[PDB]
Design an enzyme around this catalytic site. Structure first.
Site, mmCIF file in Angstrom:
data_model
loop_
_atom_site.group_PDB
_atom_site.id
_atom_site.type_symbol
_atom_site.label_atom_id
_atom_site.label_comp_id
_atom_site.label_asym_id
_atom_site.label_seq_id
_atom_site.Cartn_x
_atom_site.Cartn_y
_atom_site.Cartn_z
ATOM 1 N N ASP A 199 47.978 58.127 6.033
ATOM 2 C CA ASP A 199 49.296 57.966 6.639
ATOM 3 C C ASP A 199 49.905 56.607 6.298
ATOM 4 O O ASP A 199 49.560 55.591 6.910
ATOM 5 C CB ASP A 199 49.196 58.152 8.160
ATOM 6 C CG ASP A 199 50.536 58.053 8.871
ATOM 7 O OD1 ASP A 199 51.579 58.173 8.186
ATOM 8 O OD2 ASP A 199 50.521 57.871 10.110
ATOM 9 N N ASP A 220 56.572 57.641 3.718
ATOM 10 C CA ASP A 220 55.640 58.039 4.780
ATOM 11 C C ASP A 220 54.858 59.327 4.471
ATOM 12 O O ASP A 220 55.337 60.437 4.719
ATOM 13 C CB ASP A 220 56.378 58.136 6.118
ATOM 14 C CG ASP A 220 55.509 58.552 7.296
ATOM 15 O OD1 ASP A 220 54.257 58.583 7.142
ATOM 16 O OD2 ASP A 220 56.086 58.851 8.365
HETATM 17 N N1 LIG Z 1 53.678 59.074 9.823
HETATM 18 C C1 LIG Z 1 53.414 59.570 11.086
HETATM 19 N N2 LIG Z 1 52.276 59.364 11.653
HETATM 20 C C2 LIG Z 1 51.905 59.867 12.968
HETATM 21 C C3 LIG Z 1 51.027 61.091 12.778
HETATM 22 C C4 LIG Z 1 50.874 61.851 11.656
HETATM 23 C C5 LIG Z 1 49.940 62.955 11.896
HETATM 24 N N3 LIG Z 1 49.423 63.010 13.123
HETATM 25 S S1 LIG Z 1 50.051 61.742 14.037
HETATM 26 C C6 LIG Z 1 51.125 58.728 13.690
HETATM 27 N N4 LIG Z 1 52.233 58.019 14.376
HETATM 28 C C7 LIG Z 1 52.093 56.762 14.951
HETATM 29 N N5 LIG Z 1 50.833 56.162 14.903
HETATM 30 C C8 LIG Z 1 50.758 54.930 15.441
HETATM 31 C C9 LIG Z 1 51.888 54.295 16.033
HETATM 32 F F1 LIG Z 1 51.796 53.088 16.504
HETATM 33 C C10 LIG Z 1 53.130 54.970 16.067
HETATM 34 N N6 LIG Z 1 53.265 56.195 15.529
HETATM 35 C C11 LIG Z 1 53.526 58.777 14.356
HETATM 36 C C12 LIG Z 1 53.053 60.181 13.963
HETATM 37 C C13 LIG Z 1 54.177 61.050 13.351
HETATM 38 S S2 LIG Z 1 54.870 60.389 11.792
#
Ligand SMILES: NC1=N[C@@]2(c3ccns3)CN(c3ncc(F)cn3)C[C@H]2CS1
Length: 391
Positions: free
Chosen positions: A38, A234
């Site tokens: 990710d 992303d």
């Molecule tokens: N690129 C992406 N990653 C995520 C995920 C992707 C797959 N499962 S969760 C993780 N994620 C995240 N993680 C840590 C944080 F501090 C804030 N947001 C957002 C979610 C959807 S968009």
């Protein structure tokens, strides 16, 4: 062009809808887990307790090298949440650099809509910068640790390989989904030239889009709109996501270009599949989409061009058939442009952290037809590009 990183080529599995993952090991003795790659987050977090959708998980009590940081982490996001306990342990990537590092690991103890039934992954590797790490920027991300502790160059590159047709869970298991080259650029994974855009700021992999075309026709919006409130690259997002007003203008233009066929509103909203008789998908009626990115040289831009073979995501029919079926993989955002997996499938993408830049080249594995291919082309003279960035 020679491929210099054979050990890491073909180390990914998965697909745009469920994500692409790499095998990693954690602990002593090593515990093998599949980990989602990710570029849109900055935490390394692994299932660490039984879950209906996990076949395995990190068992801290069985690792002699586990260290407890005695601190919780809570990570809610739009579509879900995870929470867990911070610690450190020794981590390796078997099909990676031949190094072992001590890294921060969030041991996930509770979650909601994080683990996907049948995805095959058990954790997430956030490859972006400390600024967006939780609970705060003092928790050093994995890639920072790797670079600090080893001689691995401060760069990685991703080739995400879309199949161009649906894969079931067992097909994903058997199939190669791409490459993550840690510390280098493998020349076998792309054709033509690499073109680089500056990383505007080191938090997400933020870039600046300066022009958008649909089949060569300028969308003709003020360029700030394209980057409102940011534009990022992303791998953990499936779709190309566009700011609301850009989405509305783009969809109107894509509808107009494809107007020889009428599609239901549910298709354009990304909710409903469309199906054609086997082999008859009318690729030619759908337009190419070009995104122009700020170049490294003053007043220069370049463009990346994707096909419908990228932005129409193959899905299985809701009823058993030989039809070729797809969902529209462009959708609205209220958090800026997201160049997700379906766009990254067109390109080999170089995350050159050392030189604060992102490189794009046509992928050797992109899906196309006999008439059109994805492209990376330049240069173009483009003025006042700094003004395209949102503040
Ligand atoms: N690129 C992406 N990653 C995520 C995920 C992707 C797959 N499962 S969760 C993780 N994620 C995240 N993680 C840590 C944080 F501090 C804030 N947001 C957002 C979610 C959807 S968009």
């Amino acid at each position: 062009r020679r491929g210099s990183f054979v050990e890491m080529v073909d180390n990914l599995r998965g697909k745009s809808g469920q994500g692409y993952y790499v095998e990693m090991t954690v602990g002593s003795p090593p515990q093998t887990l599949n980990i989602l790659v990710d570029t849109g987050s900055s935490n390394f977090a692994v299932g660490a307790a039984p879950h209906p959708f996990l076949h395995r998980y990190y068992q801290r009590q069985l690792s002699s090298t586990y260290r407890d940081l005695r601190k919780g982490v809570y990570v809610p996001y739009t579509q879900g949440k995870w929470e867990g306990e911070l610690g450190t342990d020794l981590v390796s990537i078997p099909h990676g650099p031949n190094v072992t590092v001590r890294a921060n690991i969030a041991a996930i103890t509770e979650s909601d809509k994080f683990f996907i039934n049948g995805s095959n992954w058990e954790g997430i590797l956030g490859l972006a910068y400390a600024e967006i790490a939780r609970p705060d920027d003092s928790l050093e991300p994995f890639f920072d640790s790797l670079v600090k502790q080893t001689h691995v160059p401060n760069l990685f590159s991703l080739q995400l390989c879309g199949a161009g047709f649906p894969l079931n869970q067992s097909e994903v298991l058997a199939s190669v989904g791409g490459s993550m080259i840690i510390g280098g650029i493998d020349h076998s994974l792309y054709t033509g030239s690499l073109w680089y855009t500056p990383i505007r700021r080191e938090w997400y992999y933020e870039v600046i889009i300066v022009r958008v075309e649909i089949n060569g026709q300028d969308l003709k919006m003020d360029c700030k709109e394209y980057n409102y409130d940011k534009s990022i690259v992303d791998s953990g997002t499936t779709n190309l996501r566009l700011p609301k007003k850009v989405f509305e203008a783009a969809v109107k233009s894509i509808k107009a270009a494809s107007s020889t066929e009428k599609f239901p509103d549910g298709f354009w909203l990304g909710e409903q599949l469309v199906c054609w008789q086997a082999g008859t998908t009318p690729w030619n009626i759908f337009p190419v989409i070009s995104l122009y990115l700020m170049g490294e040289v003053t007043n220069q831009s370049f463009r990346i061009t994707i096909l419908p073979q990228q932005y129409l995501r193959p899905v299985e029919d809701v009823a058993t058939s030989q039809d070729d079926c797809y969902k529209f993989a462009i959708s609205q955002s209220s958090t800026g442009t997201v160049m997700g997996a379906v766009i990254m499938e067109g390109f080999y993408v170089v995350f050159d952290r050392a030189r604060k830049r992102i490189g794009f080249a046509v992928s050797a594995c992109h899906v196309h037809d006999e008439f059109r291919t994805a492209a990376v082309e330049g240069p173009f003279v483009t003025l006042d590009m700094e003004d395209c960035g949102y503040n």
